[PDB]
Amino acid sequence: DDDKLDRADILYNIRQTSRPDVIPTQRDRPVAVSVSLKFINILEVNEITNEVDVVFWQQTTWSDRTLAWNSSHSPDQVSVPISSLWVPDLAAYNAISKPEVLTPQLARVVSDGEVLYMPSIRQRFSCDVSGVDTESGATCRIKIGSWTHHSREISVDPTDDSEYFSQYSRFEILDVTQKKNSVTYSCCPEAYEDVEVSLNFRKKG
Amino acid sequence: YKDDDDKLDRADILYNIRQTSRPDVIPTQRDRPVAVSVSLKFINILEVNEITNEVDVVFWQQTTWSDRTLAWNSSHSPDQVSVPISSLWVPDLAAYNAISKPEVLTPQLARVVSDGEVLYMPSIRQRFSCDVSGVDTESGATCRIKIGSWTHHSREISVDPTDSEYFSQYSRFEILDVTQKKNSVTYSCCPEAYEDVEVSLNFRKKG
Amino acid sequence: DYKDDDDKLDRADILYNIRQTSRPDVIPTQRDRPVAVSVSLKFINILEVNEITNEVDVVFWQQTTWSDRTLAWNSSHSPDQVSVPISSLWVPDLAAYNAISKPEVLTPQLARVVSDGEVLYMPSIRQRFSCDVSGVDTESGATCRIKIGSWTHHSREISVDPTTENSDDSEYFSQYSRFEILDVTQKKNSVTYSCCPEAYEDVEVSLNFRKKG
Amino acid sequence: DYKDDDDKLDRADILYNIRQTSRPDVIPTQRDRPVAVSVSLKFINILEVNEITNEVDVVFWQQTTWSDRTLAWNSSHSPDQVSVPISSLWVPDLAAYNAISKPEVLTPQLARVVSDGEVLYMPSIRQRFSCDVSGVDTESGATCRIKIGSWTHHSREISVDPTDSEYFSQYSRFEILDVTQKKNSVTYSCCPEAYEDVEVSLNFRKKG
Amino acid sequence: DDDDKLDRADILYNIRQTSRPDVIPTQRDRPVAVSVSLKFINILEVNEITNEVDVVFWQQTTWSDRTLAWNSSHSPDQVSVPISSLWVPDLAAYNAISKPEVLTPQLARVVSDGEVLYMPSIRQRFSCDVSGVDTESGATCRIKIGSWTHHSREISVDPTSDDSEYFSQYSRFEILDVTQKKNSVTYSCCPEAYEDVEVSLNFRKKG
């Protein structure tokens, strides 16, 4: 796991095999991407205009098996800059600002061909904050899917509630759930898979 | 369609597109202007200021055109592919009454279809100066957005327009009507005519 | 001629010739004479004003033109003009002496190059300036100046020649703006500073405006 | 040696040699031992404080050093150190876990390379953090806790090792009572392996 | 003879072939003498509570690299060059509390005798003593500018005729005095000295 030249070699191999603009399909099956959200913070919450500002830890994984190697005497994982990798084109449907990445833009590649990209993000969303002061709290739903690939090319999926959530927040997390969802729009005949993350939270009392 | 996931067939189409594609040159065919279809679909309203007459909107910008030099036989290969928009010509659209840089909320990819059609449909948050009077009244306020090609006159580029289903439930405002008109203006600066789509939007507060 | 404007292959060749000849970092001087650059502002919107700090926020259309005849070609059977990315062309290095923010370009960064070596670049720009705003409430309006000059090139290399004057200054201006424009004028100035024995040419633009209603 | 240092050609050759031996995307691990990165925060200012929202704005000088023997050269008759743009060098991927903004880098982005293989990267950063701010308008003051860790590399590849009004501003509204720096290894339920990090405790109060 | 376009492009080519942008241009084993002056253009704001100050200043940097020099007998005396092609000094304000914002194009003059001039106009926020701004004596704010990564054996900053000369007449504030001075500090992390120039600005509000 710890020879610089072995790492430089693995990296070199990934840079040949990997085509960054082409989706990594195997055997006529959609690429199976698994998304999961962990919340880190809730910073602002406007009940008049229906917006929140959050920081979340976005764990995405997929399998590009052509990147795989034998690791019996070499390292099992390495870090690659994401400009050298195809990453999925996920978008959050009810975002109202550009996503702001707060972490170095690197992925792990695992010798079985698995790719993990888990950046931490700040973003404002437009959502229902009705009930944020009550005891049963508000429920804001976030929708996240593949922007330009339909369900026959990219298949999204959902992989404790407050394990990484700051203790210095004004808000508290009651429950967080994730549901897979295939949806068609009147524009395009094809479906787009998304994950709907439903966060249930309230102000602290 | 059944052959939509050959990673190799896909890579080959991307390669092909990158060779034929001339990103800086308008893809005219047969001495006709490029016809570009332009439409908005509103997603949200974020800020309304009745004093200064401004509005923040997130709208979904539907833009399509064709370049038959990119076409291919898709009988046994993928029907569409995604392409980074730096590899294709894109039209230089501009909103005349906009007062801030447009902010693109989605990945900057276009779809290319086997028949030579190109679809670029970004989601955009932008700020416009427009008439926002009547917004607390039953008829509502009517605000227009004028979107035309900036450098190419009508002789080279024409823009044509092709209810808020994708409009947020949680917005403070409600849409009443959305119409789309085609204008063709000659400015006192240049002897030629620039075309544009006008998008009139009637909207009002809820309660 | 206008009849051949669209032939895709012809346009590409013109774009190719332009890149082979254009030197983006060199002033296109002709015959021991300075490069003449025509400058015209047209105001679009006056976004905000602060009478206490003396700042304004404007959107203007900045029309700029100049000649490089080494770019010319025979338009007898060819497109008369084409659009070019400005990264492929020399562009004048104009600065706003009293800008207090970076310029934000609103529009696509493309120039039109015409078949006789004329280049037009007219972006739309939002910028914040520092100027005299007192009077803005009265009926005679306020009067705010903006100096714009060549930063690193002096008069014998670049001369900004005033493109004035209107009609017409209230034409591209938002009618839905809190403010209205009385008059606009332009002046060519030529200043020699402490540092350099060389003189820099600038264009002073005066905008007279008041709050409506 | 100190005499050499000013030879424009000698430096050019050193800088050439570094760009060739340096691979920016590979951790400079030697001997099967995890790269040791020494980190150190010196505070410079405390600017925006919100007691209601638990946010703070700080300008701090981050001091980072590590060792890469492959970059080393015989400096008997050449310069002992040179400046290098960090685009030419591997730099560790550090990240503040409680930062709620993107770091704003206030200084030129150069590192120093010493001829014995030490690399020194010491940028001045402004950044907003989410932390315990209550107690700030009182004498024992507040106690914030920034944590700085290796994002994608775990303990077997990168290991952080720790190491104060000297560089702090006397024109700050705030003043500093104590600063401590502990090493911390923690395992998150996602990945089997542990990540090293440095909890920097800052103790400070408003004036008067 | 300053305008022959071919002579310019040739000079610009010679400059790119011999110039190494990442290497300090030292000569005869002496440090590089970088000369620095600040002329103030404006003051945007002042916060008495927090000791912040927003200022627009014209930074005047000049230094020599005799390896760029050419014979200007029948070619131009000077030319403009993108700073990406040249080595440029890594200056920094110790008491800056914001990213510097360059308001001007990033071009340097090169003079044929080997001299380089980089003179950008900059907008930056500083933290400094601001008390006394309303009083007739005025407040005194100190900016400390120095070389960040290069110590004194490598780069030395030397300050080089009245202010209120490029200073905006429309400012709330007026400048009472400006003095430049040179210090040389060693910090407890590293045994080599770093030179800086402290610009002292004495100013007050107007009546």
Ligand SMILES: Nc1nc(-c2ccc(C(F)(F)F)cc2)cc(N2CCOCC2)n1
């Ligand atoms: N997942 C997803 N994808 C698209 C989409 C479809 C096609 C294109 C294309 F091909 F034109 F580039 C772009 C986006 C649009 C879309 N919606 C648009 C309206 O807001 C809800 C989501 N959602």
Ligand SMILES: Nc1nc(-c2ccc(C(F)(F)F)cc2)cc(N2CCOCC2)n1
């Ligand atoms: N569509 C459009 N195009 C232009 C335009 C822009 C650039 C050029 C040039 F010089 F590059 F050729 C010409 C016209 C100007 C224009 N107007 C200018 C003022 O605002 C209303 C619209 N509208």
Ligand SMILES: Nc1nc(-c2ccc(C(F)(F)F)cc2)cc(N2CCOCC2)n1
């Ligand atoms: N047109 C113009 N050019 C300069 C100028 C800029 C850069 C250089 C240098 F050093 F790069 F050569 C010289 C003069 C400075 C200048 N002024 C600076 C002070 O405010 C009034 C305008 N105006």
Ligand SMILES: Nc1nc(-c2ccc(C(F)(F)F)cc2)cc(N2CCOCC2)n1
């Ligand atoms: N040092 C560190 N690293 C991670 C982490 C980031 C990326 C990856 C991946 F996907 F690249 F493998 C793994 C762990 C996560 C993490 N924390 C978990 C999120 O909350 C803050 C602390 N801390």
Ligand SMILES: Nc1nc(-c2ccc(C(F)(F)F)cc2)cc(N2CCOCC2)n1
């Ligand atoms: N001019 C200067 N340089 C440094 C400095 C910067 C980088 C490095 C390193 F590590 F990259 F070599 C060393 C010292 C530090 C420094 N100060 C330390 C605190 O901030 C005020 C002054 N001032």
Ligand SMILES: *[C@@H]1O[C@H](CO)[C@@H](O)[C@H](O)[C@H]1NC(C)=O
């Ligand atoms: C993996 O490692 C080496 C050769 O690469 C060898 O010991 C072993 O047989 C390999 N196993 C597989 C499944 O290729």
Ligand SMILES: *[C@@H]1O[C@H](CO)[C@@H](O)[C@H](O)[C@H]1NC(C)=O
């Ligand atoms: C499309 O491709 C296949 C193979 O070349 C062929 O069967 C079919 O006739 C082609 N169609 C056209 C339009 O040429």
Ligand SMILES: *[C@@H]1O[C@H](CO)[C@@H](O)[C@H](O)[C@H]1NC(C)=O
């Ligand atoms: C352009 O016109 C002719 C015909 O295209 C060409 O041969 C000649 O070089 C040019 N001269 C004229 C007539 O402008």
Ligand SMILES: *[C@@H]1O[C@H](CO)[C@@H](O)[C@H](O)[C@H]1NC(C)=O
């Ligand atoms: C380095 O070079 C010097 C001078 O050439 C020589 O004396 C020495 O043996 C070399 N080895 C070391 C000390 O690394």
Ligand SMILES: *[C@@H]1O[C@H](CO)[C@@H](O)[C@H](O)[C@H]1NC(C)=O
């Ligand atoms: C330029 O010509 C020569 C050769 O470059 C040079 O040495 C001298 O300084 C100049 N000659 C004149 C005419 O002054």
